[PDB]
Write a protein that binds this ligand. Structure first.
Ligand SMILES: Nc1ncnc2c1ncn2[C@@H]1O[C@H](COP(=O)(O)OP(=O)(O)OC[C@H]2O[C@H](O)[C@H](O)[C@@H]2O)[C@@H](O)[C@H]1O
Ligand SMILES: [Zn+2]
Length: 249
């Protein structure tokens, strides 16, 4: 947290961010990997997989209904608020997230790309129909599509499935125009999300990583703040706002 870092952010021409589950940990939502990580307890192959869903839809839906209620009842934390503020200040141009929660939106973020879908979305397994929910469904019974005759599924992307072409393309266009990218709360192992910060770097841009742990991205991160996103982003945006207020215009 030096003056060079604050300058890099405050004077950026097109700053973007890539966030992961770590930015929602301080809202009481568990991460997937690391301490208390969901994948250290549960098995992805049995809960977040198309095969697992076809094998036991009730088991998968009960788990997601639980995840949904938790997220819908959680509140955005200081990290979410900071990203929203950085956007309000006109510094953050776009926020790309791997999170399926809607905490960035509830904090006020306007330009958000959801690479892996959203828990607010439910879609049909057969026909092209999807919609958003206000609260979690009760399981059983299994959610069915009213349009046709098939089951509904959470509108998130599971391992092995393809991200919507337009979603990845939009995210790529954003990082291709960015000179600075803040990468917060992500383990940097899941693709293609993990490759996005590399585009910024290969283009001569700067990477600012915020994570209490080192990741595969750390070696190339211009700055890597070993702390919690809530504390780090709050202080960061506070300093950035002060810097911007001093600008002669
Ligand atoms: N308070 C915190 N502030 C910032 N980072 C934190 C915090 N607490 C934990 N982290 C960091 O968050 C990271 C979370 O890593 P993951 O649990 O793997 O979450 P993510 O990178 O978003 O996962 C990628 C994707 O895989 C999943 O399967 C899922 O589909 C998900 O979207 C970890 O590196 C961890 O150290
Ligand atoms: Zn249908």
């Amino acid at each position: 947290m030096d003056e060079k870092l604050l300058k890099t952010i405050a004077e950026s021409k097109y700053l973007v961010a890539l966030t992961g589950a770590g930015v929602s940990a301080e809202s009481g939502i568990p991460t997937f990997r690391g301490k208390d990580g969901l994948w250290n307890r549960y098995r992805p192959e049995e809960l977040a997989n198309p095969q697992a869903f076809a094998k036991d839809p009730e088991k998968v839906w009960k788990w997601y209904a639980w995840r949904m209620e938790k997220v819908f009842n959680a509140q955005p934390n200081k990290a979410h608020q900071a990203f929203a503020e950085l956007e309000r200040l006109g510094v953050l141009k776009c926020l790309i997230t791997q999170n399926v929660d809607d905490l960035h939106e509830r904090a006020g973020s306007r330009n958000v790309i959801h690479l892996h879908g959203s828990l607010r979305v439910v879609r049909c397994t057969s026909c092209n129909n999807s919609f958003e929910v206000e609260s979690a469904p009760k399981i059983p019974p299994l959610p069915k599509c009213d349009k046709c005759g098939s089951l509904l599924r959470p509108g998130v992307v599971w391992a092995g499935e393809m991200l919507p072409p337009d979603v990845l393309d939009r995210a790529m266009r954003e990082v291709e125009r960015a000179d600075v990218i803040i990468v917060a709360g992500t383990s940097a192992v899941v693709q293609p999300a993990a490759s996005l910060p590399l585009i910024v770097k290969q283009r001569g841009g700067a990477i600012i990583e915020i994570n209490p742990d080192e990741t595969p991205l750390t070696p190339i991160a211009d700055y890597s703040l070993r702390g919690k996103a809530g504390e780090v982003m709050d202080e960061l945006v506070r300093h950035v706002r002060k810097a911007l207020s001093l600008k002669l215009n």
